[PDB]
């Protein structure tokens, strides 16, 4: 496959909505390469609308564990967890193309049933939102209150805007 | 496969509604062919009814990055985002057959909910319509005021009307 080819050169590709299925696949890849050579860097290209919070954390956690620096490239759209992963990349190695987009908002969910049940789902989602926000601040350089107000509602941004916010370090031109 | 033989000789195919999947495949193939020989050119054959604006921008952005000059050939139809990319080919290397059809229009989308939410959507939608029109006008040579008015509703153009408008550079006869 065209992807197996790009893999012989250390390049993983995340280009679909994030569900458990995707998460696992991208995790086994980052592991396979780190084993081939704990020195040569790896590169992860991103184009996604976000998805499961738990699913992206799996990915976000393997990028940290492995020795090899992981660099990111925004191609098309990097929204929600997807934009989260982009910022998660190695300092100085976070890229975006000229016409890419970046969208950051707050966690979505649901609840149905007894007062007490609706309460349980509510406490959890608030907690996640909080965890996700504190890391966003450390990656961007933005203070918490900002990453808190700026995510209240859908917040789309252009590549020049992402660079300013600190989600990426450079724009690949030609 | 018939399409496999196509890549082996540097010919990429784009024959379907543009979505995040078709988009990622096309991007990789471009980067692959640039690896084997940054000097020889690559051809992008087109026949698509359009698709996602973000899916389309990635394709466009990658054509601009690689060193090989990328030619484009409209075959059958090239509507919406399809005609855009078509116009994104190397100057002097954009084609189309005698009976090909090309169409341009404005972005499409939707919004539901609170007044505040429909606003966020209206702003993003109108913004993409703006970025698309400005690149179209740099590629065609046409003034922006014209692109804007000419795209208020579906605009179907013959291959001759395509050549004259600046969407292509030469018609292939025999």
């Amino acid at each position: 496959d065209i992807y197996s080819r790009l893999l012989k050169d250390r390049i993983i590709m995340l280009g679909s909505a994030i569900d458990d299925n995707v998460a696992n696949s991208i995790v086994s890849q980052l592991l396979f390469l780190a084993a081939e050579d704990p020195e040569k860097e790896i590169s992860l290209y991103i184009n996604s609308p976000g998805g499961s919070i738990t699913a992206g954390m799996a990915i976000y956690d393997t990028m940290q564990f492995i020795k090899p620096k992981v660099s990111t490239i925004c191609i098309g759209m990097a929204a929600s967890m997807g934009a989260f992963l982009l910022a998660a990349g190695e300092k100085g190695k976070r890229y975006a193309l000229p016409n890419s987009e970046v969208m950051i908002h707050q966690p979505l969910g649901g609840a149905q049933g007894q007062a007490t049940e609706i309460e349980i789902a509510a406490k959890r989602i608030l907690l996640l939102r909080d965890k996700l926000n504190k890391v966003l601040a450390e990656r961007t350089g933005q203070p918490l209150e900002v990453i808190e107000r700026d995510t209240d509602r859908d917040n789309f941004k252009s590549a020049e805007e992402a660079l300013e916010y600190g989600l990426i370090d450079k724009i690949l031109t030609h | 496969d018939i399409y496999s033989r196509l890549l082996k000789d540097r010919i990429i195919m784009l024959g379907s509604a543009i979505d995040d999947n078709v988009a990622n495949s096309i991007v990789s193939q471009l980067l692959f062919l640039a690896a084997e020989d940054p000097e020889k050119e690559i051809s992008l054959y087109i026949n698509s009814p359009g698709g996602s604006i973000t899916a389309g921008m990635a394709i466009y952005d990658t054509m601009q990055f690689i060193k090989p000059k990328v030619s484009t050939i409209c075959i059958g139809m090239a509507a919406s985002m399809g005609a855009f990319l078509l116009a994104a080919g190397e100057k002097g290397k954009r084609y189309a057959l005698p009976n090909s059809e090309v169409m341009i229009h404005q972005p499409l989308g939707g919004a539901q909910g609170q007044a505040t939410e429909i606003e966020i959507a209206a702003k993003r939608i109108l913004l993409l319509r703006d970025k698309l029109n400005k690149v179209l006008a740099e590629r065609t040579g046409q003034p922006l005021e014209v692109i804007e008015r000419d795209t208020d509703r579906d605009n179907f153009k013959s291959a001759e009307e395509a050549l004259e408008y600046g969407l292509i550079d030469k018609i292939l006869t025999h």
């Binding site: 250390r10 490239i73 890229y95 | -």
Partner: peptide
């Protein structure tokens, strides 16, 4: 996407 990613 090189020079330099790879």
């Amino acid at each position: 996407f090189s020079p330099x990613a790879p």
